[PDB]
Amino acid sequence: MNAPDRFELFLLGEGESKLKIDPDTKAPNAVVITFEKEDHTLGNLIRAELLNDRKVLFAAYKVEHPFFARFKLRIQTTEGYDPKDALKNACNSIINKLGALKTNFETEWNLQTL
Amino acid sequence: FDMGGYFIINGSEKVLIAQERSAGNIVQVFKKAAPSPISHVAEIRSALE
């Protein structure tokens, strides 16, 4: 009766973005980026791949409320080097390792019987 | 599975809950603080079968 519809987990609504951008009001060269319609499959893999980059001062996320599936990401970087670029450049590192798994899996799968 | 016992009345089932009571025809001895006139009472409830 008050249960919210099941699809409100990936179906983005009207006048809603899949990324939001505001800087942190306190620490400079730092941004809080608001992902929408997403859980810590994207909240987790993104932070722990923001850590390999030494050019990145800060990296964290929080599931704000189990009720609305949306996490916020806080990032702080080295003077002059954009945070938006920090993310952009970190995402492709994932992709690359992922498109690595596709190949490596099938190469080994094909060699198995049954 | 219905093992029954209920009386079917007006189209709903009714059940009889065992009523309780102090047994009859037994002589019992009662006190009964004294202030108060009396101090001791022998009592028997009495009814036929």
């Binding site: 009766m1 859980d39 810590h40 499959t41 987790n44 599931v63 189990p66 | -």
Partner: protein, 196 residues
């Protein structure tokens, strides 16, 4: 509730992913706080969950029979020859992070009861509406979409905060605010009010 006076309602539902899982990938149906455990004493709930496991592995229906020769150290010798650890525990991974949970969890099968009383059958709200004729007070219970009683004991807590206009309100503009005509001498409701 379970079979042991273990009443407590759902507090959330986490999909199989956000759910803590096991070394084999067993998802729990059911998560209670280990805080409604000692309070509270109910050591049986524990043992039920310890026996019911073995039974689900060995195939054999377990004997949870009351005054009998069955021991925690008798189940433990069996759950130990079944590839789990003797007192029910299991190593678990946090679903949000796939990081091991630093403390082992107590995990297994406990027969659970669904009692009546579901929010959607209790949930009630009224803001104005149908009232009686005797008192012009809101009618009783959700069945005739009525209010709630602001009883004596309630009245007490209010004076306690000294909320003074709040006790004009919750006893005038939310119950009765009838309006009559008093006589300046013979202070009684008899005056004929020919209006407007």
């Amino acid at each position: 509730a379970s079979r042991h006076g273990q009443k407590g309602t759902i507090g959330i539902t986490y999909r199989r992913e956000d759910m803590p899982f096991t070394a084999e990938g067993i998802v729990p149906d059911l998560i209670i706080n280990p805080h409604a455990i000692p309070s509270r004493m109910t050591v049986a709930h524990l043992i039920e969950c310890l026996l019911s496991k073995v039974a689900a592995l060995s195939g054999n229906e377990g004997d949870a029979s009351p005054f009998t020769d069955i021991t925690v150290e008798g189940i433990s010798k069996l759950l130990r020859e079944h590839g789990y650890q003797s007192r029910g525990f299991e190593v678990m991974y946090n679903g949000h992070t796939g990081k091991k949970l630093m403390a082992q969890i107590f995990f297994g099968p406990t027969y659970y009861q669904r009692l009546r009383h579901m929010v959607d059958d209790k949930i009630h709200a009224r803001a104005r509406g149908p009232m009686q004729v005797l008192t012009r007070q809101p009618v009783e219970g959700r069945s005739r979409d009525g209010g709630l009683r602001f009883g004596e004991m309630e009245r007490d807590c209010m004076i306690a905060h000294g909320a003074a206009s709040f006790l004009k309100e919750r006893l005038m503009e939310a119950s009765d605010a009838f309006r009559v005509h008093i006589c300046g001498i013979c202070g009684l409701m008899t005056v004929i009010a020919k209006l407007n």
